């Protein structure tokens, strides 16, 4: 009876710790004895400890978590792919929550509900990766969606935060409605909400032999909703505004934690529920458009957060290249690109949060940064080059293997567009470089020193980026095992 | 109620077979041209029989 729950401890524990943190915060934030203490950093440290403990629980249950798989079959199906995806998403969440501690006390934002909502959205993401049915898929999407709608509008003094939160709300609600309408007809035309039986009724007959106007258009609507979820061009109506308006730690959690889970979800849907080979076309054109428009639009931006938003869109296109070529190498390149992009995004947002102590807004404020803090300047330049794809760094390997996967399937146009978009993409990255090493403005902005957690995370990520090409075997082997575990 | 239905099911079967042979002789009557019509056959390739479908979803509530 109780031992049938050995496969859900990494989630039951995080829920219980979330409840304990919420209770402790609400009890001791209104105590007159301590005079309404600012227990946001306390709740944040306890939440980081809880995330570490549930990561330890998840890591040591590799032989476990596959028991009572018949009992849990209707609800979720977790396997080697799900195990690694969860163990990486939880690490990303831990890093994000760790690098935002100074944000709580530097600008006096002691709202512990931020941390509990991070934790609960992370629980929703952990549900999403294990989700193996349309209903659980949609519910796990909605958990993180509502958590982020609440969190984005948390800072209720700036017109950017509120308007960005409202735009995110409306766009996410429309995307969720589109996706749910898509799932409704796939249920209607076949029954069989479960993924296991959805991958068996559609494999029997190809879409070319006979045309089913329900399943095809439901699959199309599901794909459209998912592309809205990851903000893939042309479904990028407000994403730069969302990333600019939202608070910096929120945007740090976004574009890493949500995208990983949504991409795992899209992998599960694409591999099983798609046998008509009609999602190759929708991913093809949309990824090409994302590549081109991200490369051509990030060069015209003068702020920092908008540039990171458009770089995220471009990297989403680069990763989506892997969906068009459906092979083991394509999925391997996709997952490796996701991993490298997650590390580089964490490093870049650590940079942005570091200069947030003095309210950095534009790209010209970080002028002559090689004089005040040379080592931070070097770190930022290295991270920017890693974004660019320069060979002697991580990020070049991901683009390399994505191009290899694209050429493996004979999508020769994908390789050419990838090359040209990379060529333009590196240009404005180097443009960012010039204003930060070479030309010195008349007025210099002075940045106060950083704290230990952000510095440690930044140093670890910087040494990972530079020295990745020396020893990349473990990542490649993890990714090859994960790609094959979708079937066996 | 479980010791009463075999006779009610029996009379329902009688009525249904009466209506079914009437409809079969009606269908064989209209279709004498266009050779290739096998009159009444099981559309189920497995051979299992189910009641004739009607385009009225949930009819047993009104």
């Amino acid at each position: 009876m109780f031992n049938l729950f050995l496969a859900v401890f990494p989630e039951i524990f995080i829920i219980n710790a979330t409840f304990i943190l919420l209770i402790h915060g609400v009890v001791f934030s209104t105590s007159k004895k301590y005079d309404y203490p600012p227990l946001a950093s306390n709740v944040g440290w306890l939440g980081l400890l809880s995330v570490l403990i549930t990561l330890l629980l998840l890591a040591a249950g590799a032989p476990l978590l596959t028991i009572a798989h018949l009992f849990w079959n209707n609800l979720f199906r977790r396997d080697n792919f799900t195990y690694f995806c969860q163990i990486f998403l939880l690490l990303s969440t831990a890093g994000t929550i760790s690098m935002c501690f100074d944000f709580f006390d530097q600008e006096r934002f002691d709202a512990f509900e931020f941390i509990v909502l991070i934790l609960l959205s992370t629980c929703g993401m952990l549900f999403m990766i294990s989700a193996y049915d349309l209903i659980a898929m949609y519910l796990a999407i909605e958990l993180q969606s509502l958590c982020f709608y609440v969190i984005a509008a948390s800072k209720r003094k700036s017109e950017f935060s509120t308007e960005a939160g409202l735009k995110y709300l409306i766009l996410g609600a429309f995307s969720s409605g589109i996706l749910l309408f898509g799932c409704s007809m796939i249920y209607g035309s076949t029954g069989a909400t479960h993924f296991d039986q959805l991958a068996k009724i559609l494999t029997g007959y190809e879409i070319t032999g006979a045309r089913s106007s329900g399943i095809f258009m439901g699959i199309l609507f599901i794909a459209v909703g998912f592309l809205f979820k990851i903000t893939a061009v042309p479904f990028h109506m407000w994403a730069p505004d969302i990333y600019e308006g939202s608070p910096t730690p929120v945007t740090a959690f976004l574009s890493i934690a949500p995208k990983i889970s949504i991409f795992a979800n899209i992998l599960r849907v694409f591999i099983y529920g798609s046998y008509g080979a009609t999602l190759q076309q929708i991913f093809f054109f949309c990824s090409i458009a994302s590549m081109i428009l991200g490369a051509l639009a990030a060069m015209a931006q003068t702020k920092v957060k908008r540039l990171l938003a458009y770089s995220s869109i471009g990297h989403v296109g680069y990763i989506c290249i892997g969906f068009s070529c459906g092979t083991i190498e394509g999925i391997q390149s996709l997952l490796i690109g996701i991993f490298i992009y997650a590390l580089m995004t964490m490093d870049a947002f650590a940079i942005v949060l570091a200069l947030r102590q003095t309210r950095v807004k534009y790209i010209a404020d970080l002028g002559a940064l090689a004089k005040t803090n040379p080592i931070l300047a070097i770190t930022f330049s290295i991270t920017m080059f890693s974004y660019a794809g320069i060979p002697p760094l991580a990020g070049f390997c991901s683009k390399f293997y994505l191009f290899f996967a694209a050429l493996g399937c004979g999508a020769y146009f994908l390789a050419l567009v990838g090359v040209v978009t990379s060529v333009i993409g590196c240009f404005y990255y180097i443009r960012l470089v010039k204003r930060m090493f070479f030309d010195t403005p008349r007025t210099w902005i002075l940045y106060e020193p950083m704290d230990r957690n952000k510095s440690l995370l930044l140093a670890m990520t910087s040494f990972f980026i530079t020295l990745f090409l020396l020893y990349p075997s473990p990542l490649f082997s993890v990714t090859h095992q994960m790609a094959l575990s979708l079937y066996l | 109620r479980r010791t009463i239905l075999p006779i009610l099911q029996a009379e329902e079967d009688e009525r249904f077979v009466s209506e079914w042979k009437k409809y079969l002789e009606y269908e064989a009557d209209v279709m004498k041209d266009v050779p290739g019509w096998k009159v009444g056959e099981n559309v189920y390739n497995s051979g299992r029989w189910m009641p004739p479908a009607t385009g009225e979803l949930r009819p047993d509530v009104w």
Binding site: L22, I23, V26 | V61
Partner: protein
């Protein structure tokens, strides 16, 4: 089994007619947040009632499992309501 709603429809039509004939006799002669908060709490604690309704009726069929799942649901909403209570937003 569901023909018993047409009487409701006819009753509603006749009640509307009676209301009309009752109203026609003489003829023939700024913002508060607390309101939003109480509405939200009502919505949240009305969804739980809509969830309770299938649980109570079918509680016989399900022993020691549905009961404990509903108890976990109640515990989650009780944690929510406890956070509601201490934070304020519940008194005027």
């Amino acid at each position: 089994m569901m023909l018993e709603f047409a009487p409701i429809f006819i009753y509603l039509v006749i009640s509307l007619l009676v209301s009309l004939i009752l109203l026609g006799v003489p003829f023939l002669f700024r913002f508060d947040i607390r309101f939003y908060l109480v509405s939200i709490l009502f919505l949240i604690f009305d969804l739980e009632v809509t969830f309770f309704f299938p649980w109570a009726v079918s509680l016989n069929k399900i022993d020691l499992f549905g009961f404990w799942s509903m108890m976990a649901f109640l515990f989650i909403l009780t944690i929510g309501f406890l956070y509601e209570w201490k934070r304020g937003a519940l008194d005027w």
